[PDB]
């Protein structure tokens, strides 16, 4: 009656009785959050939550297994630039937690807790909640030499910054010295940064900028901060852990369902071995293949009853094949980026090449596997009769 057309090696179209699909072409448009801890970062990027945005305050001291970034995310405080944005974002995303612990640094003769009109916290001007804008006091900015050891049993992440003012007048008004310098060092690394004056396009009526840097202090080490000016000090340290965590860009609602494989389009079932939805996956997910339909011959050939032993033998063999293929999936948690909003150059080209190679190889493997299994299934079902 009804038949299904499948592909083998010797033949390109064979009419068989029953055929299953190994490629998932659809997804429920919801990021189910039952078995994974999912944190919805509406109007808030990961870096804006690492620092203190006046509108990302609710994400502080929060843990996650997957961070969801939305396309409507925007910044609403002092303009800033991270010289290596991707590295910091990936490091914090794979860390899996934001837990701030305050420290009492020995700052001398300076004005702390400086505010700006870009940040508004309710009704008053403000700044980042995890940083410290150190300006001059009484037109004097003494040199800062501050030390802090790591007596604990885990690495500590420190986020600090440099200030780039528009003009020399602004620099002198904020910090008494004409040109500042920052040196943040440990027993195994050093970062020396020099500010760059100059005008920039105004974001929220500010022609200055802030550059953001990070340092990791290992157990038994020591962090030394030596600065003459233009320093945005840290208020404490974050905690770095190794585990399963990542970050995704997806404009999909979060629901109460349960599912293991996540995708920017939604959560997809992982029974079938392959998928066709998106190349960005989290958790135990099917592999990506360019094909839209890949069908496995689960029945005998179709040409237009007490033999139970032969029927049982054929059913057992086919069900064993299906058990080997269906349901056994691999879990990949943090991977490389696969979508780019800007054009950068060599590294982006290398990443695109790697993903194209992976996709092509896995598509070839899927096509060959379906071909072989169809051929051997038809051969065994012909041999049983």
């Amino acid at each position, epitope marked *: 009656p009804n038949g299904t057309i499948v592909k083998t090696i010797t033949n390109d179209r064979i009419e068989v009785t029953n055929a299953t699909e190994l490629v998932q072409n659809s997804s429920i448009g919801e990021i189910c959050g039952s078995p994974h801890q999912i944190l919805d970062g509406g109007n808030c990027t990961l870096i804006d939550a690492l620092l203190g945005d006046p509108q990302c305050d609710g994400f502080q001291n929060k843990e996650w297994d997957l961070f969801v970034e939305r396309s409507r995310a925007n910044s609403n405080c002092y303009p800033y630039d991270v010289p290596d944005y991707a590295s910091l974002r990936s490091l914090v995303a794979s860390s899996g937690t934001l837990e701030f612990k305050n420290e*009492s640094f020995n700052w001398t003769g300076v004005k702390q807790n400086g505010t700006s009109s870009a940040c508004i916290r309710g009704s008053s001007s403000s700044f980042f909640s995890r940083l410290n804008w150190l300006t001059s006091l009484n037109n004097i900015y003494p040199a800062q030499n501050v030390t802090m050891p790591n007596k604990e049993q885990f690495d500590k992440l420190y986020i600090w910054g440099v200030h780039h003012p528009d003009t020399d007048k602004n620099q002198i008004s904020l910090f008494a010295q004409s040109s500042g310098r920052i040196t943040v060092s440990t027993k195994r690394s050093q970062q020396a940064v020099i500010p760059n004056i100059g005008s920039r396009p105004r974001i929220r009526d500010i022609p200055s900028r802030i550059s953001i840097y990070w340092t990791i202090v290992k157990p038994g080490d020591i962090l030394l901060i030596n600065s003459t000016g233009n320093l945005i000090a840290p*208020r404490g340290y974050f905690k770095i852990r190794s585990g399963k965590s990542s970050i995704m860009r997806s404009d999909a609602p979060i629901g109460k369902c349960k599912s293991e494989c996540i995708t920017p389009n939604g959560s997809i079932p992982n029974d079938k071995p392959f998928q066709n939805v998106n190349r960005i996956t989290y958790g135990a997910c099917p592999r990506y293949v360019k094909q839209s339909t890949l069908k496995l011959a689960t029945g005998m050939r179709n040409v237009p009853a007490a033999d139970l032993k032969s029927t049982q033998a054929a059913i057992d063999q086919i069900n064993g094949i299906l058990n080997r293929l269906i349901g056994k999936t691999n879990e990949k948690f943090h991977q490389i980026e696969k979508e780019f909003s800007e054009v950068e150059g060599r590294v982006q080209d290398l990443e695109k090449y790697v993903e194209d190679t992976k996709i092509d190889l896995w598509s070839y493997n899927a096509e060959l596997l379906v071909a072989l299994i169809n051929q051997h299934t038809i051969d065994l079902t012909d041999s049983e009769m």
Partner: antibody
Amino acid sequence: EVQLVESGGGLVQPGRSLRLSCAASGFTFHNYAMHWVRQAPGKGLDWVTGITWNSVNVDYADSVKGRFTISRDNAKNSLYLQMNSLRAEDTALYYCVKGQVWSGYYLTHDAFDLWGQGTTVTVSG
Amino acid sequence: DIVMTQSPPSLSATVGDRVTITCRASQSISNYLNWYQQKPGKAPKLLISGASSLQLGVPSRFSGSESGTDFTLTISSLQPEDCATYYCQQGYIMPGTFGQGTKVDIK
């Protein structure tokens, strides 16, 4: 410098109500969370209540639930406690306490960095 | 609703000895323990926050450590000014859970 001064307290009969006030001078009041703690005479320290800046997350202890109310006034730099139904178990010295995190949405993950010389509340016949 | 346990309830040491106070928690607090020192007739003063961070103005003879699952406060060289009562407090869950007191007396 930095200080918290508490006013109110005294002797009140059981079942009556009174209001304690804490005035802060020397720091930006609209940044730090504020708590009320109490100490019985020679017994120990017991947490009472806590509120944050912007007054979104407010928490009370189990033994003082439903009869106590804590409020803020950032314009006037004040923290207010109102106690309505009182028992003999509340005769204690009350401390107005400042938090440590510079701006915390939530009341936890913090520490008490400044304390005030509290006021005595006695509930007896 | 964490039950903080302190030890010893009362301690005595000579001027110059080494003093150690230990504190344990019912559940797992992620290294959020604060040490408080109270002299008779005065308000408590915070010594260490985060179990390892000395506050400004506290003498360096005070140290905090995380020994296994227990938290230790150590006074390396006790002085007559260090006769007070010490408390350990959590900050993970909202209900503040102060421990009992370890009263220290000099000889």
